[PDB]
Design a protein around this ligand. Structure first.
Ligand SMILES: CC(=O)N[C@H]1[C@H](O[C@@H]2[C@@H](O)[C@H](O)O[C@H](CO)[C@@H]2O)O[C@H](CO)[C@@H](O[C@@H]2O[C@H](CO)[C@H](O)[C@H](O)[C@H]2O)[C@@H]1O
Length: 241
């Protein structure tokens, strides 16, 4: 019941400009190293994978990411099949959704199908962020309390979420990993906003490191290990029947 799908096996060498835009500078951890990325230099399509890359070109760090113009409502499931080429110390690869036309983050929500941090190398993080949860100034999220801690991010896996009016469910290789639930409170507390906007698709490989001279989460960057790609074999959204 297939709503949208990219298997990156097109005529073309870069993800279809109809659907996909490139991530851009922002004074936060993931977005920092977008500033000064010359066009599509960290993003290509090649034997059927979207290949997102992180390098340090001449002194200065470069992230590789795109996101969808288009969003999707509740009653969908998102599926992203991806590996990392290698564990990169300071890597910060991300498969996530984000709301289009939401009041300022986090109010309208954020959903993370996969993120990776050098600190817990044998584990990924499936995480949900709201206003209710974080604060505004907070950005901790709520991750699987009881996750998989012998995981190999460098094999292909299929990262995945369901959004219903009722709740957000995460999967990995098609096993449920855990869920966050609408509690149906005073809609004011913005406890569960994940259906009030459409949520998009954001694929990136960012470098972490220092930020305004305070170290971020993905921790210290090791140049030795650069570059590193994340390959998205494909991306699929499915209405539920
Ligand atoms: C703490 C932080 O960096 N927050 C930004 C947010 O976050 C990410 C994490 O919370 C999560 O783990 O997923 C990825 C993994 O790489 C991020 O690190 O991302 C949003 C959207 O880009 C940010 O927001 C935007 O900020 C700008 C101002 O710079 C703008 O004002 C806009 O309203 C807001 O959406 C977080 O800063």
């Amino acid at each position: 019941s297939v709503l949208f799908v990219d298997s990156f096996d097109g005529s073309s060498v870069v993800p279809d400009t109809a659907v996909w835009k490139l991530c851009t500078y922002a004074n936060n951890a993931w977005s920092q190293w977008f500033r000064d990325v010359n066009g599509y230099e960290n993003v290509k399509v090649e034997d059927g994978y979207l290949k997102l890359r992180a390098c340090k070109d001449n002194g200065t760090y470069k992230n590789g990411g795109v996101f969808s113009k288009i969003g999707f409502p509740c009653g969908t499931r998102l599926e992203v099949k991806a590996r990392l080429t290698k564990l990169v110390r300071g890597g910060f690869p991300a498969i996530w959704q984000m709301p289009i036309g939401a009041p300022e983050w986090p109010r309208g929500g954020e959903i993370d199908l996969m993120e990776w941090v050098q600190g817990t190398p044998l584990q990924i993080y499936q995480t949900v962020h709201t206003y209710y949860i974080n604060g505004a100034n907070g950005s901790a999220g709520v991750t699987n309390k009881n996750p998989d801690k012998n995981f190999d991010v460098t094999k292909d896996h299929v990262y995945a979420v369901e959004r219903t009016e009722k709740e957000v469910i995460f999967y990995v290789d098609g096993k449920e990993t855990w869920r966050y639930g609408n509690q149906y409170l005073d809609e004011g507390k913005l406890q569960y906003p994940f259906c009030e906007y459409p949520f998009n698709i954001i694929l990136n490989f960012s470098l972490g490191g220092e930020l305004n001279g305070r170290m971020t989460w993905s921790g210290e960057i090791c140049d030795e290990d650069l570059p590193g790609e994340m390959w998205v074999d494909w991306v699929r959204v499915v209405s539920l029947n």
